[PDB]
Ligand binder design. Structure first.
Ligand SMILES: N=C(N)c1cc(-c2ccccc2)c(Cc2ccccc2)s1
Ligand SMILES: N=C(N)c1cc(-c2ccccc2)c(Cc2ccccc2)s1
Ligand SMILES: [Cl-]
Ligand SMILES: [Cl-]
Ligand SMILES: [Mg+2]
Ligand SMILES: [Mg+2]
Ligand SMILES: [Mg+2]
Ligand SMILES: [Mg+2]
Lengths: 10, 235, 235, 10
């Protein structure tokens, strides 16, 4: 899945 | 409390060590132990708590997506049924994710949020509450509606406080709006709300950059760029 | 046996799923459960077992090095003693590493090796035994000598069989020699043995490449390049 | 520490 930008690490 | 016999300061120190060793499950257990000492958390300590669990749940979410994608294919017209194993193992990982989310939510509810009075702490934890209901929402299929509204509610209370008490460039405020934006787009199926929020958040920050030091400028524009990255994909 | 109620085939299938999800602790527990079913392992199943535990122990070794390096500095002339916490946490990670090594060694000893009669299986497991005594040796400080000799002994028996029963390009044979070479250099403090072994192994493979198919050529030269990489650093 | 090449993954 294409994951959108969210705060902090991955 | 498995960490009840260790000093609060030692739990914090070992959390910092675990981060350097990229041992995020350890890091998370140390910070859980620190929270359960019952004292409020400093800004640095809140950020340790958040980094630890974000990394842990990040691994599970990534694993879950891989497994859910395999499962969906196995159920496509034309497949050769491999048996229950894909579903069972997706369920295993899903269950472990939900437990991590429930743990975090338990720490926020007992009793981080209720003791957080400053905007920087209370907004931080309310954002976290919305984040972890969002990760629950990502895997939910049965009472998804109340989970989604719990996420929405936490983010909205955080938004309201952030907008009264924090400047538009405040990194906590920006990161909250970023995350609430993705909530709207992906979880609430409100892409137009998501786009509106991200544009307004970016523009209001942009007009306040002039008040910042070089270092605060860097912190804010870093998150502003994440807002822009999403807007590029969405528009 | 936590995996005793699950079918052998399902454990294998879920091991393969866990690998795709990059869930190597899960992958390792599934393969442990498969081994403890008591049947011999196929080539693919042996490779699943090895990949799972190599990834698990890889994370711990990397964590241990970070922590051991921090500890060494804290003990340097001039430091401000942070207390017992670095040592304690290094010890925690070290203990978990040793347990993983002991688990693997237990599977080899009960009863994979004793039931392995074909060169490809017996060499594979004896290499593994040497590998896991080597990871023990990396953290050993008190009876390090017997651990080292256990590693040496396993690698040497594997070498002897590989040289009688396998061609010089056999990927298992090459990987064994690679690892025994690093043992010599880093664990046994025998750099000249390490260099000699790596050169002879490379040259004898090189002269046998002409017998291979395109695909076997690729498999062998891949490991030959690892031999060359080390030789470049060592000479 | 500089880690030398050994078989399989890291
Ligand atoms: N140990 C860690 N990972 C962090 C420690 C701190 C910190 C916070 C206040 C005072 C000292 C340090 C972070 C702040 C921060 C978070 C996010 C982005 C950029 C910066 S992060
Ligand atoms: N699931 C995995 N990771 C692997 C599966 C197999 C396999 C082995 C025999 C028959 C089918 C597949 C591997 C062999 C191999 C190991 C090392 C290097 C290159 C190739 S690896
Ligand atoms: Cl399962
Ligand atoms: Cl510890
Ligand atoms: Mg479920
Ligand atoms: Mg529109
Ligand atoms: Mg020890
Ligand atoms: Mg010499």
């Amino acid at each position: 899945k294409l994951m959108f930008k969210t705060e902090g690490p991955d | 409390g498995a960490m009840g016999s260790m000093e609060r300061a030692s739990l914090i120190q070992k959390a910092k060590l675990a981060e350097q060793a990229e041992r995020y499950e350890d890091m998370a257990a140390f910070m859980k132990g620190a929270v359960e000492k019952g004292e409020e958390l400093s800004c640095e300590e809140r950020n340790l708590l958040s980094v630890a669990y974000k990394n842990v749940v990040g691994g599970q979410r990534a694993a879950w997506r891989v497994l859910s994608s395999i499962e969906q294919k196995s159920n496509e017209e034309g497949s050769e049924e491999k048996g229950p194993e894909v579903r069972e193992y997706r369920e295993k990982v899903e269950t472990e994710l939900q437990g991590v989310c429930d743990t975090v939510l338990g720490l926020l509810d007992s009793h981080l949020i209720k003791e957080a009075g400053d905007a920087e702490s209370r907004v931080f934890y309310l954002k976290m509450k919305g984040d972890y209901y969002r990760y629950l929402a990502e895997v939910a299929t049965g009472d998804k509606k109340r989970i989604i509204d719990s996420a929405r509610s936490a983010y909205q209370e955080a938004m309201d406080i952030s907008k009264k008490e924090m400047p538009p460039t405040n990194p906590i405020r920006l990161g909250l709006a970023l995350n609430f934006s993705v909530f709207h787009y992906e979880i609430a199926n409100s892409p137009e709300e998501a786009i509106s929020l991200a544009k307004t958040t970016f523009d209001e920050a942009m007009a306040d950059l002039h008040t910042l030091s070089e270092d605060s400028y860097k912190d804010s524009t870093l998150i502003m760029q994440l807002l822009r990255d999403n807007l590029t994909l969405w528009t």
